[PDB]
């Protein structure tokens, strides 16, 4: 908790998806890749794939559900992503109308809505800024050129290769259908 | 390698979470690792160790209104347990500095300091006499106000006033004091 950390990048380096469309972004995404400044690849017990489901409310905010396989059971979390200043940016927590003192911040960096996306996350604890990036997929598999591009972008925010992980696909919990 | 079977949360505040568990019985057990993660994306925040006799630990420096996964792992020499994981959301931060001013025989003024830079949807004032707790009043106060004046109070009577901050349906722990009216 006192060890050194790779600095979170300026928001000048984390651009948003242009003309971002909240209605096209909704629905289920598999987390195909992950990167972060506190994230270390551990091949003795790897990180498993999980899914998020972004449901667009009348609010214009998202009701984001995470589904994970953990301790031999399916685990469900629900959070509210409130929209920030620009389309594709979201906040969580109680600090909102005070930019750059935000508890937890989300930015959709790029997406083609029907196949893939890259989302940047940033939060604070004990005066230390943590940041994290996900490579979302509409399916569990993605193309090697999309993963290479994720590695490329992650390096542009200052992460080396050993801070980048591609979760192992799993059949439990994460292939649930659901009406909307 | 045994897991803890009774991990629980206590002292849940806006920036911190307490843990209690019953330490196990083994010569083999050397300590307990504690892992904190930001839930959802599963962002690792920190790890921490305590020794085999310890059945208590406080996570500090957390951010209010946010979801964290906290787990405890039993440690042996060259090995360990499966994690025991729980998910907990930090509280809404309460107000501070409850003063009572303008003491009449049938009225008082109640001031508090809001939690700074937190955007609440409202405050929530409850008052009742000390001697009849069943007769409680609730006023919903604007998140931009920091004071309310109470009226129609009984003279020579001690009241319990509490102020809680509220965001959506979650509310803070109450800020509570006691002022009595004059005659």
Residues 56-85 of B with CB under 8 A from A: 60-67, 82-83, 85
Residues after which chain B is broken (C–N above 2.5 A) are none
Strand duo B158-167 + B170-171: pairing: antiparallel
- CA neighbor of A26 nearest in space, from A50, A58, A68: A58
Measured CA distances, B104 to B178, B180, B182 (Å): 15, 9, 6
Residue A31, classed as helix, strand or coil, is: strand
A66 touches B at CB < 8 Å: yes
Phi then psi for residue A148, to 5 deg, are -55, -45
Residues found in chain A: 180
Phi then psi for residue B132, to 5 deg, are -140, 80
B40 touches A at CB < 8 Å: yes
Residue A162, classed as helix, strand or coil, is: helix
In chain B, which residues fall in CATH 2.60.40.10?
A: 1-90, 91-183
Phi-psi region of A81 (alpha: psi -120 to 50; beta: other; left: phi over 0): beta
Stated as kind and residue range, the H or E segment containing A151 is: helix A144-156
What is the torsional sign of CA A140, A36, A21, A19? negative
- Which listed CATH number (2.60.40.10, 1.20.1250.20, 3.30.450.40, 2.10.109.10) goes with B1-90? 2.60.40.10
Experimental method: X-ray
**Residues of B whose CB is below 8 A from A38:** 43-45
Query: Which pair of tokens denotes residue B45?
Result: 């925040």
Superfamily of domain A1-180: Calycin beta-barrel core domain (2.40.128.20)
Superfamily of domain B91-183: Immunoglobulins (2.60.40.10)
**Residues of A whose CB is below 8 A from B46:** 1, 125-126
Nearby residues of B181 by Cβ (< 8 Å), 6 or more positions away: B103, B104, B105, B106, B107, B108, B153, B154, B155, B156, B157, B159
A140 touches B at CB < 8 Å: no
Resolution (A): 3.0
């Amino acid at each position: 908790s006192t060890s050194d950390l790779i600095p979170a990048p300026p928001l000048s380096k984390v651009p948003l998806q242009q003309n971002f469309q909240d209605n096209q972004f909704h629905g289920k995404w598999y987390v195909v890749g992950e990167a972060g400044n506190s994230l270390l690849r551990e091949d003795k017990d790897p990180r498993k794939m999980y899914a998020t489901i972004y449901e667009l409310k009348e609010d214009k905010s998202y009701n984001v559900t995470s589904v994970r396989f953990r301790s031999k059971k399916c685990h469900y979390l629900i959070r509210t992503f409130v929209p920030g200043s620009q389309p594709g940016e979201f906040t969580l927590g109680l600090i909102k109308s005070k930019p750059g003192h935000t508890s937890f911040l989300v930015r959709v960096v790029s997406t083609n809505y029907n196949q893939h996306a890259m989302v940047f996350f940033k939060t604070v604890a004990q005066n230390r800024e943590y940041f994290f990036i996900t490579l979302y997929g509409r399916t569990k598999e993605l193309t090697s050129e999309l993963k290479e591009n994720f590695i490329r972008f992650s390096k542009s925010l200052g992460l080396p290769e050993n801070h980048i992980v591609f979760p192992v696909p799993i059949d439990q919990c994460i292939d649930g259908s659901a009406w909307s | 390698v045994p897991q803890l079977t009774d991990l629980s949360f206590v002292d849940i505040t806006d920036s911190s979470i307490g843990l209690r568990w019953t330490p196990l019985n083994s010569s083999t057990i050397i300590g307990y690792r504690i892992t904190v993660v930001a839930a959802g994306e599963g962002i690792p925040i920190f790890e921490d160790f305590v020794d085999s006799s310890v059945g208590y630990y406080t996570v500090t420096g957390l951010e209010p209104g946010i979801d964290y996964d906290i787990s405890v792992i039993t440690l042996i020499n060259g090995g360990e347990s499966a994690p025991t994981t729980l998910t907990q959301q930090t509280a809404v931060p309460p107000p501070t500095d409850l003063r009572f001013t303008n003491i009449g025989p049938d009225t008082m003024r109640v001031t508090w300091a809001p939690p700074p830079s937190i955007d609440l949807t409202n405050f929530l004032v409850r008052y009742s006499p000390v001697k009849n707790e069943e007769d409680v009043a609730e006023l919903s106060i604007s998140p931009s106000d920091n004071a309310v004046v109470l009226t129609n109070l009984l003279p020579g009577t001690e009241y319990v006033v509490s102020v809680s901050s509220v965001y959506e349906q979650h509310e803070s722990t109450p800020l509570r004091g006691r002022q009595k009216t004059g005659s």
